[PDB]
Subunit: 287 residues, 4 copies
C-alpha cells in the first residue's frame, strides 16, 4: 500500500554561544542551530523500535560538544563538522542536514576604538547557512542573508506594463522602493573563505540597489535590479554556483488629501503593511 | 554565461472576507492569499522591459474581483479559480501558484444554540492550501493544517535507544508528549469534498494522538505515532496521494527540587521553549 | 540630589505546569509567572550592597517550590500565596507584586465525554491576573481577559457624529464590528470564587456584544455597548469593585469595485490591520 | 449604583512617513501614532449619543493632515501638535494623549560619503514618546528608548546575597551580562532639543553599561549600574525630571559537559530566553 518518500528527525532551536579569548579581546559567535538526521533503517517508524535512534537530547549534546572540540570559526564550518561527525562516528546515518541561524552581534564602537568584550545588536541583515551531506559523499553548502530592509525614495519607476480588465494603476515616473531582501546561494566547493564571501554578497546587494551615492542609479524594473545583482555576484565570486533572490515590494503611497481640501505634493506617505509585491529569481552558471 | 533555473512574481498578503447572507443568518470566510506568476518572456529580467508585466496591483484587484464574481466556497476552490484565470486570460503566463491561509472564524455557540451573525476566534488548528498549475497541464492541490498544539500527560514513553559518548538520557516508561502538529498532503485529483476532507485529516490526527477518552493509547516513539497517523490518513481519505507530518516535541521536564530539600513526585513541571525534538515523515501511496 | 519614586526587582517568565492526579483523571494548569519585590533598604542601588538581595534565581526556585507545597488552584490564589510568602518569610520586603498569565489549555471533549489526560490549545480569551500586597496590609487582586477576538457582521451602526473640516466618513445604519476585547477588574475582597467570577465576566462581555442568538441586538455606539457591559458585570459579580474595558475597532471595509467595472454591493470586504479605532472606559461603584 | 473613573477613545497604529527634499538630499521620518481623546460629555456611554464624537477616521485624517500642514521634525514635536489641535479646534475635549513609535531608518553610508536617498534598517535602539495634555493646562512629554540589546562577556559578578531555604546559587566573581534596556523619562519643560536629548540618554546608557573600551568596569550589581546610569542621565540633561530604567538579565550559562566526560572551560554557553532576571527603578529630582 505505502512507501517512504522522505524521513528525518532531530533537535531544533539549539542555541549556543562560543567564545575565544585572546588577551582581553573576546571573540564571540552566537547561533541557533537545527540538525536533521536520516537513518538507514525505518524500523522506528514501522514497529516503534528505538534501537537505532540517536536521541534528540544526544543531538543536542553533540552540538554543544562539537562546539568545544572543533570550536566555531563560522556557522558554515560548524555545520560541516556536525555533518562529518554524524556520518563518520556512525554507520547507519545516511543523511544529515544542518541549518544554522547566526545572531547578529556587532562589536560596540565609539570613533574607531573597539570594545574588547562589549557587543550591540544591529541586524542590518541576518546571516544563515545550510550543510547537507549523503553517506561518504561530497557535502553541499548553502549561505544566505535575510530581513535586510532597505529604502530608496527615488530613481525607480514602473511604466510600460499591460492593462487588462482589472488594471487601475497608471504609469509612475518616480516612486519609493522598499524591500526586505532574502538571498540564498549554493557554493560549488567546500573550500571558501565564508565570512569574506558572505560580506561580498551583502555588499553587492546593497550597492546595486542603492549606488552611486550621489544621484543614485535609475532602475525601470525590480525584476532587472534583482537580475543584475545575480550577474554581479556570479562575477565577483567564482565559488557561488547558483543564486536565489526574493525582494518584497513594501508599499509607500502618497496620501491623497484633496477630499479634506489640502494638496499633498508628495510629502506625506502611507506605509502599508499589507499587501506587498513579491519578485523572485534563481539563476545558475551555464554548466 | 548563466541560465535561469526559476522565476516568479506577484502579490502576497492579500486579505479578503467574503460574506453570503440569508436575511439575518450570515455565513463568512476570511483568508490571506499569495499569488505567483511565471512569464514566458524574461525581457523584464534581461533588459528591464515591462511590456509583459501584469502589475502586482492587478493581481490584487483580481483576487478581490474573483471573490465577488466567483464567491468563495473554500480556500482551495478559490485557489483553483485564480490559477485558471491567469492561465486563460493571458497567453504568456506559463505557471501560477497560489498559497492561502484561512482566518479561523468559529460561529458563536452556547448549549446547542448558534448565533446568526457573531463569531469568536478559537483556532484549534489553522487551515491552509496551495494550488500550482502549469499552462495546459492539470492543476495540483496541496492542503494542510498547522499550529495544532496538543498535550498528553501520560501514555507515552521512550526506552531502548542507542547510547554513544554523548547520550545522557535515561530510559522512561512514562512522560509528557506535547506537540504542535503540521501536516501537508497532495491530492491526486481536483474532485474533493474539501471541507469534510480537511476536518477528517484533523480528527484523525487528534484521535490517534489522544486515543480513547477512557484510557488513552500508549506510544513508544513519536515516529511511530507519526507513521500510524499517515497510514490512518491514507485509509480514511482516497483522494489524498501523499502526506507529510512534522511533529515537534515541545518538552515538559520534572523539576528536580532535592537541591532545595523537597521531593517533587512528578507534580510540578518546567515548560521549556528551546530546544525541541523534531520528528518528520513523508509517505505516499505505492503506485 | 535625587529621590526614589519606586524600586523593584524579581524574576519574569517563570513557566510552570502543576498536575493533580485524581485517579486516571489529570488536572492541569500551566502559567507564566512574573514576580516583583520592593525592599526596605536601597543600599542595593546606592552602594551595590547585595546582603539584602533575595537572588532572582531564588525567587524562581521559590515559585517552583510553592507550586509543590501550596499546590495551584487558580492563577489568583497562587499569586496571593507568592505574595504572602515573600512578606511573611522575610522582613525587609515592603511590597510584592505578582502578575501571571494562564496557558489556555482546554480538556479534549468528544461530545460530552472528556479525555482523562489529553488537552488542546484553544485561545478563546486569555486569562491573567495580578495580586499586589504591601507589608501588613490586606492584598489587592486584579483579574482580567485579553485577546478575545469577536466579530459581528450586522446589528452595528454609527450615525450622527461631529462633522468638522477634516471629517470624510459618512453615516452608516449597518457595518461590521470586530474587536479583540481586553478587560481588567479589581475585587473588593480576597474571598472570591475566582474561576467562576472570571467565567461570568467573559460570558457577560460575549453576551452584551452578541446579544440574543436569534435577532441580535442593535448597538448604536461601541461606547454604549462598552458601558452597558460594565454595569452588567457589576450586578452579576458583587465582589468586582472596578472594571476597565479596552475595545479595539478592527476594520473591515467594503471593497469598492466601480473603477474595475463591478458592483460589489456588500459581498467582499477588505480586512485592514492598521490603523484601528480604539475605545476605552473604566467604571467603579459609587463608594 | 456607579460613577466613571476614566474614559478615552481614538485611533491606534496610524502609520506615517514624511519626506523633505532639499536638492538631491532626501530626508525621511517614519512613525506610527496613537491618539486618545477625552470628552466633557459622557452622553455617548450613557445613552449612545454621538453628537459630541469626533470619529476615529477623522482622528486618522487629522493626523495625516497635520503631518503635511505642520511638518514632522521629531516624533515629540508632532505629538505636541496633535495635542494642541484637538484641544484648541474643539471645546468639549478635556484631555489628549498621543503615543508615537519611530521606525528606525538610518541613512546608508560607505567610505565617508552618505547616500542622498537610500536607507537601511538598524534598530540599535527603538525610539518612542508620549505627549499628554489637559484642556488649558501645560502638556507633559515623556520620551524613551527600548529593545536595546547589549552584551558583555566579563566585568560583572554577583556575590554577598541573602540566603534562604530555597537558595542554591553560589558566589560568582565573573559572568556574562546581557540585557535589553528600556528607559522612559519625563521632561520638566516641552522646550527641548529632542533629537540630541534622546541621543545623549542612549549614549549614556551604552556608555555606563560598557565602561572603557579597554578594560571595562567591574560591576557588582545591576541595581547599582541602574542607579548609576539614572544619575548620569539626570546630571547631563537638565530638562529630564524623572527617569525610569528596566534591565532584564538574559542569562548565558556555562554548559557543564562533565556528564559526557568533557571540561567546558568557559568556552561554550547556552543562551536562555526564559526565565529572566529583572531589575527596575524610577528616580526623580527632589522638588
Amino acid at each position: 500500500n505505502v512507501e517512504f518518500v522522505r524521513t528525518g528527525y532531530g533537535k531544533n532551536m539549539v542555541k549556543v554561544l562560543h567564545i575565544r579569548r585572546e588577551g582581553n579581546h573576546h571573540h564571540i559567535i552566537e547561533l541557533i542551530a537545527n540538525v536533521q538526521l536520516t537513518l538507514k533503517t525505518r524500523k522506528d517508524y514501522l514497529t516503534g523500535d528505538n534501537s537505532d535512534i540517536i536521541p534528540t537530547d544526544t543531538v543536542k549534546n553533540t552540538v554543544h560538544a562539537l562546539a568545544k572540540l572543533k570550536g566555531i570559526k563560522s556557522i558554515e564550518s560548524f555545520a560541516l563538522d556536525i555533518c562529518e561527525h554524524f556520518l563518520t562516528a556512525f554507520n547507519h546515518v545516511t543523511r544529515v542536514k544542518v541549518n544554522i541561524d547566526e545572531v547578529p552581534w556587532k562589536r560596540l564602537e565609539k570613533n574607531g576604538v573597539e570594545h574588547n568584550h562589549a557587543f550591540i545588536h544591529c541586524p542590518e541583515a541576518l546571516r544563515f547557512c545550510e550543510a547537507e551531506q549523503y553517506l561518504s559523499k561530497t557535502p553541499v553548502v548553502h549561505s544566505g542573508l535575510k530581513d535586510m530592509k532597505v529604502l530608496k525614495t527615488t530613481q525607480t519607476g514602473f511604466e510600460g506594463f499591460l492593462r487588462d480588465r482589472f488594471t487601475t494603476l497608471t504609469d509612475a515616473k518616480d516612486r519609493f522602493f522598499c524591500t526586505s531582501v532574502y538571498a540564498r546561494w549554493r557554493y560549488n566547493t567546500i573550500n571558501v573563505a565564508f565570512d569574506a564571501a558572505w560580506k561580498a554578497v551583502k555588499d553587492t546587494v546593497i550597492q546595486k540597489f542603492a549606488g552611486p551615492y550621489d544621484r543614485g542609479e535609475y532602475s525601470p524594473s525590480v525584476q532587472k535590479t534583482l537580475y543584475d545583482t545575480q550577474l554581479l555576484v556570479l562575477d565577483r565570486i567564482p565559488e557561488v554556483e547558483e543564486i536565489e533572490i526574493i525582494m518584497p515590494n513594501q508599499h509607500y503611497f502618497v496620501i491623497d488629501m484633496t477630499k479634506i481640501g489640502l494638496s499633498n505634493k508628495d510629502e506625506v506617505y502611507l506605509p502599508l503593511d499589507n499587501p506587498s509585491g513579491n519578485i523572485t529569481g534563481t539563476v545558475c552558471r551555464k554548466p
